[PDB]
Paper text:
IN first catalyses 3′-processing of the vDNA ends, exposing reactive 3′ OH nucleophile groups that it uses to attack a pair of phosphodiester bonds within target DNA (tDNA), resulting in strand transfer. In this work, we determine the three-dimensional structure of the deltaretroviral intasome and characterize its interactions with its host factor, the [name]-[name]γ subunit.
To aid the interpretation of the cryo-EM map, we generated a high-quality homology model of the STLV-1 IN/NTD using the SWISS-MODEL server, and determined a series of X-ray crystal structures spanning the catalytic core domain (CCD) and the C-terminal domain (CTD) of [name]-2 and -1 IN.
Author numbering:
A (entry chain B): 54 to 145, 155 to 197, 200 to 209
B (entry chain A): 54 to 146, 157 to 197, 200 to 211
The structure:
């Protein structure tokens, strides 16, 4: 749907169990390039949501238009304020399968080395999927930048 | 020093006071493009070192060569095993970058006292990599030129 990089992203929160806790992985995916940002948070309040959104912006750049579900955090005024501050249109699966690839990569890296910190695994997965996996022949990173 | 993006990085840890504590900002900067990665950690051990380096790789790409000081973390065996495992050359053969970031932090936290440190760090990165024009290019543009 996005016509170029950073036109439209889709975002969701998905869950992942690590050493007994069920973490919130805040996920952003660019609908043109497929490039992805994931941030491991403990919860899904507006603070964590904005926090993970800012991290995605450092990774991918600032999007024109983001699409989400009707989650409370996305509908909160804190988040609406952020969006307006940043000049981002906000409206209410590419995500489901992107999620799938990330989780299979965390499961693999954790099987190989059980004591791997969750952050390392997430950053290894992000680098693999964005920058290594070829799709035309291009990586998501190439098409993004 | 680096001849194209991701040829040679420099990294260092530097200190930043926020509220009570003295935080470790693990900084990696690409010597060709300028592009920067910064990870806020509570300490400067090999765990924290490796973690911050993986975040940088996810932000920046994998470098061929890294230059660091002689700090404990960098000389440890966990760090050396990470490097060889990733085909990164490491030597012990930045301070201006550290200064530009800390100045953006200070400015951000002066305008809004409650702004979380992590958000300030990510706002800085985005500004410094993708907004500041230098050449007439940003660091990001140079970093991603094929
Ligand atoms: Mg949801
Ligand atoms: Mg030092």
């Amino acid at each position: 749907r996005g016509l170029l990089p950073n036109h439209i992203w889709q975002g969701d929160v998905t869950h992942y169990k690590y050493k007994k806790y069920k973490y919130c992985l805040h996920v952003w995916v660019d609908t043109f390039s497929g490039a992805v940002s994931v941030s491991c948070k403990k919860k899904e309040t507006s603070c964590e949501t904005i926090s993970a959104f800012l991290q995605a912006i450092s990774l991918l750049g600032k999007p024109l238009h983001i699409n989400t579900d009707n989650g409370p955090a996305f509908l909160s005024q804190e988040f609406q304020e952020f969006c307006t501050s940043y000049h981002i249109k906000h409206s209410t699966g590419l995500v489901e399968r992107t999620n799938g690839i990330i989780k299979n990569l965390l499961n693999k890296y954790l099987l190989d080395c059980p004591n791997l910190p969750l952050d390392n695994a997430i950053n290894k997965a992000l680098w693999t999927l964005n920058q290594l996996n070829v799709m035309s022949g291009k990586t998501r990173w190439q098409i993004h930048h």
